[PDB]
Design a protein around this ligand. Sequence first.
Ligand SMILES: Cc1cccc(-c2cc3cc(C(=N)N)ccc3[nH]2)c1
Ligand SMILES: [Ca+2]
Length: 223
Amino acid sequence: IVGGYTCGANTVPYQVSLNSGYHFCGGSLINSQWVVSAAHCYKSGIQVRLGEDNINVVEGNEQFISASKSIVHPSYNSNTLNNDIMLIKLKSAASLNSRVASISLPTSCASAGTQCLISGWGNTKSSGTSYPDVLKCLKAPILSDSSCKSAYPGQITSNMFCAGYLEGGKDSCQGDSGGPVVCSGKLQGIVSWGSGCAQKNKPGVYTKVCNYVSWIKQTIASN
Ligand SMILES: Cc1cccc(-c2cc3cc(C(=N)N)ccc3[nH]2)c1
Ligand SMILES: [Ca+2]
């Protein structure tokens, strides 16, 4: 997260860290047994870490649970990142509490102008590299589809939306991928891609979760 702020320990209880010996992507807890992340975050040997703030220090509210199964969207295209969404099932149900909670799925899509909360442990620099130990937060509005498509001609599909600021300075970044974009209490996006980080006229691109609710619910119910 570039141009953001320190969320505060466990202020984003649904935020998860995917670990394969190190933090490599974010995710969102949707119920005690399932996590939603980006398909491009797929990897074998994933351990889901919940209740995290400083990912390099055991602070006392963590829950480390190995993934038992991963399900990348049937139509995921790694070349274009269309349908960049994946589900991860926990080997054992997480113990829900004030610091480890699920985020509700949307019942309808969000409109341009809606403010959202984007979070993660990704790079905090627009130029160069610096990875934070504590969770970073960023408030950003959903942008018009036209401004999104103008920035990335021919690359934006109906399963993607842009959020952030065209002037630059505030954006999600490498390491935040797979993480949450929550608007009006609903998980509306997943950190997916973009161009550089916090660059002018190059907003972040997010997977449009409202298009996948039917798939998510049916998949979780059958697995
Ligand atoms: C699979 C793959 C290949 C090459 C680049 C990316 C990527 C761009 C990007 C841009 C942002 C951003 N500035 N919001 C966040 C995460 C991001 N991930 C992903
Ligand atoms: Ca920790």
